[PDB]
Amino acid sequence: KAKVDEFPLCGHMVSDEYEQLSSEALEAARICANKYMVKSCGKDGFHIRVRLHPFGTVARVHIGQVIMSIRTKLQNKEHVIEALRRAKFKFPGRQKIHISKKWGFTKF
């Protein structure tokens, strides 16, 4: 089950570049974001996930496409921003950070 009720604040690393991202860069970024989150919110104070596939491998990203998402308690908003802001260093091109109560999903 997804802790949507307990971790209502969502942070999203939104791509602003079209490009291929290696499994190594994506994992690096997840490590980075995870590390800061555990020491800032507690190993169980959040949920993190890479929204790209295949996840060596290579994954494609489009402009405006979510790369990574974190959910936690409203009080940790600032830590999420810092987690995503650091992690975006493992990826070339430009990335943006979006905060909301929605996790988002692919739709047609």
Measured from the CB atom, the residue of 30 and 88 that comes closer to K ion is 88
Single residue of 42, 52, 91, 99 touching K ion by CB under 5 A: 91
Number of residues that bind K ion (CB under 5 A): 3
We find the least distance from the C-beta atom of residue 52 to K ion, in angstroms, to be 15
Q: Per CB under 5 A, which of residues 59..88 are in contact with K ion?
A: 88
In this structure, how many other beta carbons lie within 10 angstroms of the beta carbon of residue 26?
24
We find the least distance from the C-beta atom of residue 99 to K ion, in angstroms, to be 18
We find the least distance from the C-beta atom of residue 66 to K ion, in angstroms, to be 15
Footprint of K ion (CB under 5 A):
88, 91, 95
